[PDB]
Design a protein around this ligand. Structure first.
Ligand code: A1BTG
Ligand code: ZN
Length: 139
């Protein structure tokens, strides 16, 4: 679990969004595993606007942060799960690192701010849904 809070928006994994997230829906994209809902309280986070390929992410299944080198956002095949059919997930960045069910929502950050959130795992890999292209989150 986990979310990004920026301005009057909350960014979560689409497959973990709550009834309240859906009742206050701003935008969602099943192909990216993202959903953004509106909030009344002002958010605590700032979004990176950069091309960094190194950063640090929080891994809840280890209660630790790990440094990673990750690929540029791209279209990557993801195996079927209880949440999605087998499909290509877009705007996804892969890295070598630990991730298991329960780790989705952990934040990936670089020196400029929030880059994205954990969205895929297994096989000693961790995949992050990029949010750096969502410029409207900042206004
Ligand atoms: C049960 O899923 C897993 C199985 C083995 C290892 C890892 C997972 C789980 O790692 C977080 C994962 O990758 N996904 C489940 C949730 C939806 C994710 C997606 N389609 O963006 C895919
Ligand atoms: Zn950066």
């Amino acid at each position: 679990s986990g979310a990004i809070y920026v301005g009057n928006y909350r960014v979560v994994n689409r497959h973990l969004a709550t009834h309240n997230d859906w009742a206050n829906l701003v935008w969602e994209d099943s192909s990216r595993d993202l959903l953004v809902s509106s909030t009344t309280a002002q958010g605590c986070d700032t979004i990176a606007r950069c091309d960094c390929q190194t950063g640090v992410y929080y891994c809840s299944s280890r209660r630790k942060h790990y440094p990673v080198s990750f690929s540029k956002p791209s279209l990557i095949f993801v195996e079927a799960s209880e949440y999605y059919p087998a499909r290509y997930q877009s705007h996804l960045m892969l890295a070598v690192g630990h991730s298991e069910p329960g780790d989705c929502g952990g934040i990936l950050r670089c020196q400029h701010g929030v880059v994205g959130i954990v969205s895929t795992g297994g096989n000693g890999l961790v995949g992050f849904a990029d949010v750096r292209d969502l410029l409207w989150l900042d206004e």
